[PDB]
Design a protein around this ligand. Structure first.
Ligand code: K
Ligand code: MG
Ligand code: MG
Ligand code: MG
Ligand code: MG
Ligand code: MG
Ligand code: MG
Ligand code: MG
Ligand code: MG
Ligand code: MG
Ligand code: MG
Ligand code: MG
Ligand code: MG
Ligand code: MG
Ligand code: MG
Ligand code: MG
Ligand code: MG
Ligand code: MG
Ligand code: MG
Ligand code: MG
Ligand code: MG
Ligand code: MG
Ligand code: MG
Ligand code: MG
Ligand code: MG
Ligand code: MG
Ligand code: MG
Ligand code: MG
Ligand code: MG
Ligand code: MG
Ligand code: MG
Ligand code: MG
Ligand code: MG
Ligand code: MG
Ligand code: MG
Ligand code: MG
Ligand code: MG
Ligand code: MG
Ligand code: MG
Ligand code: MG
Ligand code: MG
Ligand code: MG
Ligand code: MG
Ligand code: MG
Ligand code: MG
Ligand code: MG
Ligand code: MG
Ligand code: MG
Ligand code: MG
Ligand code: MG
Ligand code: MG
Ligand code: MG
Ligand code: MG
Ligand code: MG
Ligand code: MG
Ligand code: MG
Ligand code: MG
Ligand code: MG
Ligand code: MG
Ligand code: MG
Ligand code: MG
Ligand code: MG
Ligand code: MG
Lengths: 206, 117, 65, 146
RNA sequence: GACAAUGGUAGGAGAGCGUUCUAAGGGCGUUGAAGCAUGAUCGUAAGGACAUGUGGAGCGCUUAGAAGUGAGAAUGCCGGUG
RNA sequence: UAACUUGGGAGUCAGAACAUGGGUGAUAAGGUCCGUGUUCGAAAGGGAAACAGCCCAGACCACCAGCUAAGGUCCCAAAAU
RNA sequence: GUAGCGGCGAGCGAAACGGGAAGAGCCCAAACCAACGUUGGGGUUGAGGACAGGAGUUACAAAGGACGACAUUAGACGAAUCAUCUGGAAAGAUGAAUCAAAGAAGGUAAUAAUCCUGUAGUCGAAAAUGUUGUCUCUCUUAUCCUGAGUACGACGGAGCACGUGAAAUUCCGUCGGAAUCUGGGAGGACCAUCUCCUAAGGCUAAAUACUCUCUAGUGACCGAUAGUGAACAGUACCGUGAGGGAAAGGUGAAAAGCACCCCGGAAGGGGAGUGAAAUAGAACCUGAAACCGUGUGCUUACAAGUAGUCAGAGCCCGUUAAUGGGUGAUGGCGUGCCUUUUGUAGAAUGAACCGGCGAGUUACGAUUUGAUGCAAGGUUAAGCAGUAAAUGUGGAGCCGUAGCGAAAGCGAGUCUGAAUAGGGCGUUUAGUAUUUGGUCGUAGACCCGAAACCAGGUGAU
């Protein structure tokens, strides 16, 4: 319910009220697992192919007559048991993406955010004050907030200077409130979200 | 992705070949005949673990027969007497006593004869 | 691709509420002089597709609800 | 839940059966197909409903009936579904659609008589069953045909 | 603790072993990885370690995901050698 | 100590001997076709010299313990010259 | 996978409505004027026509110039590390630093954000090529007619989802052959009314299809029997020809690629050197198995055999130290494996041996089970936005909440029936979406194998 709001220097600048319907639910692990699996599968390109016996070059003619030579009967030099022959089955190009009900997606996002809330992985900041990109300044800011290595930074809209300053730091990822996804939240050890971004997330996810 | 054949085939076959150590010629060398002979060896050993108990009971009985005929008695009558006397010494022990301690065996024969008369 | 309904079957059965198939009766086309009065009267009454036949033909009518 | 500690729900996942991979699985060699005949062949087996040459069931049975091109099918609302509206409400197809009572309107709305109506209402529908009209008017309400 | 059951082809059901790849976590490696070779090692099986030699730069483990995932027979295909 | 019902998944549609009730054949066939039972099939172990189908008997694993079944006890070869 | 078509078999299989992407409308012929039938003017439709600045080379007419823009085809700059240890070599380990709009990647004597080439970011074109904006430059301000060998019809065919059928609608051959706004055509035979449209002339961007290519990239794609046939080739080789069609990758960090001596004609070796390593010496990383040899610890020349197994002395050793290892006089027991069979030691099939490769897969539908979300409701599809993502939006559509009947219909009932009868199917709640597993269907559908059939070519050396 009541979460402390911090200044980038690390001082308590105030307090915020975040709804228990977004950050205070019991995480649903089955739905969250399904969401993570869905997102990882949607990332697959699926470009993988082999040549079956029809696609391998040549192989039109019968290699030798059916009977009389003493050899095994053969139909084409590109049959699967032949060296250099066609592949039986094997990979064929396809998509791995699938879908789940919208309510399950929302429940998964809420579960990830709530898990961050329980494990003390939620840090609310007053506002990011970055006029010019400087990776060193953002690094020091994360130092002053006592943040772990894996941190997800959430701003209300696309903040270009924050994204530029935090881009090159390994373990640090930046997203907007609209762009929150389960993989990104789950990977992070802690969440650093502004007051406005927290309010927007609470509004959109109810 | 593609799974190459890899090393598992060689490892499995080499296990069988090592199990065929000491076999004659190709039977300790070539995987196919070695596998057949190791299967045969397992089946034989299973059968022979059961046959061994029969064989050793037979050996003990033969020895007990010899020892009892040394006292003017047959095996069958001696065992009948020992059973009627309430003596529960089994055949391995009786044969070992006959080999090791002739006098104790003679006393056992005396008890068996007494229980019959 | 979609499975295709057996159109000949679809012209001969209807699905009931419980999922069974109501069917018409054979021997009702002609040669009525050779069947007795009661035979024809009772052959006017519809039957169901038997369970043994359902086991064989269910996929042919999967779309006919 | 961490990415290094993922767990599917119990009973939600199951390993697929791979036939023709050795005797111990129980589906090696013949791969569950038994021995020989048509059903043992790749691409083998008769078409569904084939009875081996005995006249099939859907040929020994006659065709029946026809399909009406102008068949009218109505969306149906029973009395028990009208109980969600407050007393004095004016029920209309727009209101029934907006309230989730009717998803697809079809050829029109018809009120049927299942359930009990315990609320006075004014109902405008294309069709009414006799018991629906009687129970709507009996409870003090009115109905109109639109 | 105390009773029962546990031969098995077609076939049905269950549980596991191992292979390659991916994600996350945590590790190993020129003070020597994978591979190979030897050994009197461990596990109920598939199989898993350790030690030593060879080798000379990559590779395990945990959890989950995906498969070109396991060969002794096809007068199978190719190569090598009897 | 099963039985039935409803669903998911099958395989099977070449059978064999023995005993017994019968057809057929010649009160022939290790013949052939039906009824009944067993075994083999899909069953190892002991007996029948050897010997799927006969007799005893159904192997979870280990034991250099014991009692028995059919069948046996002069030697081969366990147990009565 | 509906309506329909269909030896009403196997199968074939729409369209309109609705939701979206894209969006654009126009020019003639004719009447009628001017001129000497041919040119101009004029006109273009659902009732119109005759008569009475704004648009443009993407259709709507068509050729050009000026200046600017952008982009493409070369490039340029581009932050930040030192030390010790082990090593042949440091990027590894250890200690202490730094940069970051740059922690993509590759190289460098092992594994590098700070060594190199780069990356983020910024800059750049003499010339040519495009796309483009402005200026310019162009052009403009119901009396008569309305597509005739036409529509249409018969016969024969074809195309329409539709096999000639109740067959409309479209086209072809042959033969016939209209009407003229009171006109003509369609609304699934046909007729009448009604409704919608206006054939027998032409033009038109976009949304859509494909990839030999080019540029920049990507992959729970291959990694030398794989992946292209081809990492070094449509070559070698085969064939008269059309045509068929391989095998073959790896020294080392650096050639430092072995001076010199010795045997030998040489080949090949043994030394000596180089190198971290030469059992890395070019037939060059690793170097399995079959197979071929040399040495010997135990054993074997009176013995009858699927070669082992169980028992067991003797001899020889000594381990992942375990009631150890090797061999084995002698005794018991014992007719390989696979396939196919009632039944195989079978004298039925298959395998010389070793190695590699070699067979239920995927897509879209159906059904069922398990899982999960929501629940009288559940759920979107295309599309749009987004990073080829998750996701957001999108409610058209789909299933369910009600069935019965051939249908009209009626409705917790309904059908049959004259029935207030009896009987059939129903009512007296639970569905739906995604997904693991099983199975089915359409696809080559577990893999290999015909004899053949058809089409287009090549051959009378
Ligand atoms: K033969
Ligand atoms: Mg071909
Ligand atoms: Mg690979
Ligand atoms: Mg292999
Ligand atoms: Mg009739
Ligand atoms: Mg089985
Ligand atoms: Mg096999
Ligand atoms: Mg079968
Ligand atoms: Mg077979
Ligand atoms: Mg058969
Ligand atoms: Mg086939
Ligand atoms: Mg069993
Ligand atoms: Mg048993
Ligand atoms: Mg199974
Ligand atoms: Mg399993
Ligand atoms: Mg496994
Ligand atoms: Mg590997
Ligand atoms: Mg394979
Ligand atoms: Mg072979
Ligand atoms: Mg040879
Ligand atoms: Mg007889
Ligand atoms: Mg017979
Ligand atoms: Mg009989
Ligand atoms: Mg039985
Ligand atoms: Mg037996
Ligand atoms: Mg026996
Ligand atoms: Mg016997
Ligand atoms: Mg005899
Ligand atoms: Mg015997
Ligand atoms: Mg006999
Ligand atoms: Mg006794
Ligand atoms: Mg004897
Ligand atoms: Mg004796
Ligand atoms: Mg530079
Ligand atoms: Mg630099
Ligand atoms: Mg250094
Ligand atoms: Mg016209
Ligand atoms: Mg036609
Ligand atoms: Mg037509
Ligand atoms: Mg028609
Ligand atoms: Mg017409
Ligand atoms: Mg290789
Ligand atoms: Mg190749
Ligand atoms: Mg290939
Ligand atoms: Mg040299
Ligand atoms: Mg030399
Ligand atoms: Mg030399
Ligand atoms: Mg040298
Ligand atoms: Mg070496
Ligand atoms: Mg080598
Ligand atoms: Mg002699
Ligand atoms: Mg001798
Ligand atoms: Mg001999
Ligand atoms: Mg023997
Ligand atoms: Mg059989
Ligand atoms: Mg036979
Ligand atoms: Mg044999
Ligand atoms: Mg022979
Ligand atoms: Mg054969
Ligand atoms: Mg052969
Ligand atoms: Mg082979
Ligand atoms: Mg299949
Ligand atoms: Mg079936």
């Amino acid at each position: 319910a009541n979460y402390d709001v911090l200044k980038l220097d690390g001082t308590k600048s105030g307090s915020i009220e975040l709804s228990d319907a977004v950050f205070g639910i019991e995480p649903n692990n089955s739905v969250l697992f399904e969401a993570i699996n869905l997102q990882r599968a949607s990332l697959r390109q699926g470009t993988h192919a082999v040549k079956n016996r029809s696609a391998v070059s040549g192989g039109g003619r019968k290699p030798w007559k059916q009977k009389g030579t003493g050899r095994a009967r053969q139909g084409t030099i590109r049959a699967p048991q032949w060296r250099g022959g066609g592949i039986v089955f094997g990979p064929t190009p396809r998509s791995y993406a699938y879908k789940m009900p919208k309510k399950m997606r929302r429940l998964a996002l809420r579960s990830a955010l709530s898990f961050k809330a329980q494990e003390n992985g939620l840090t609310v900041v007053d506002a990011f004050n970055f006029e010019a990109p400087k990776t060193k300044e953002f690094k020091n800011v994360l130092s002053t907030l006592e943040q772990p290595k894996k941190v997800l930074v959430v701003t209300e809209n696309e903040d270009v200077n924050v994204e530029l300053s935090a881009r090159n730091i390994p373990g640090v990822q930046v997203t907007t409130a609209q762009g929150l996804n389960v993989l990104d939240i789950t990977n992070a050890d802690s969440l650093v979200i502004t007051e406005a971004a927290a309010k927007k997330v609470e509004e959109v996810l109810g | 992705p593609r799974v190459k054949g890899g090393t598992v085939t060689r490892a499995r076959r080499k296990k069988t070949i090592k199990l065929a150590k000491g076999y004659f010629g190709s039977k300790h060398t070539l995987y196919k005949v070695a596998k057949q002979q190791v299967m045969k060896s397992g089946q034989y050993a299973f059968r022979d673990r059961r046959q061994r108990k029969r064989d050793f009971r037979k050996l003990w009985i033969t020895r007990i027969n010899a020892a009892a005929r040394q006292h003017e008695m047959s095996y069958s009558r001696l065992m009948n007497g020992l059973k009627k006397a309430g003596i529960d010494i089994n055949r391995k022990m009786l044969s070992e006593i006959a080999i090791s301690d002739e006098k104790a065996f003679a006393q056992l024969v005396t008890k068996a004869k007494d229980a019959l008369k | 691709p979609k499975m295709k309904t057996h159109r000949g079957a679809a012209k001969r059965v209807k699905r009931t509420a419980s999922g069974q198939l109501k069917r018409s009766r054979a021997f009702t086309s002609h040669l009525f002089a050779n069947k007795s009065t009661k035979q024809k009267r009772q052959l006017r009454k519809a039957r169901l597709v038997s369970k043994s036949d359902m086991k064989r033909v269910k996929q042919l009518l999967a779309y006919k609800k | 839940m961490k990415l290094h500690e993922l767990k599917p729900a119990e009973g939600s996942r199951k390993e697929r059966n791979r036939v023709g991979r050795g005797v111990a699985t129980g589906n090696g060699k013949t791969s569950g197909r038994g021995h020989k005949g048509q059903k043992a062949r790749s691409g083998g087996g008769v078409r569904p409903g084939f009875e081996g040459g005995q006249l099939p069931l859907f040929r020994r049975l006659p065709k029946r009936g026809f399909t009406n091109i102008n068949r009218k099918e109505y969306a149906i609302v029973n009395l028990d579904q009208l109980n969600k509206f407050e007393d004095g409400t004016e029920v209309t197809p727009a209101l029934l659609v907006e309230s989730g009572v009717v998803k697809n309107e079809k050829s029109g709305i018809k009120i049927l008589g299942n359930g009990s109506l315990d609320k006075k209402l004014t109902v405008k529908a294309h069709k009414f069953s006799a018991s629906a009209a009687e129970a709507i008017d009996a409870k003090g309400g009115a109905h109109e045909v639109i």
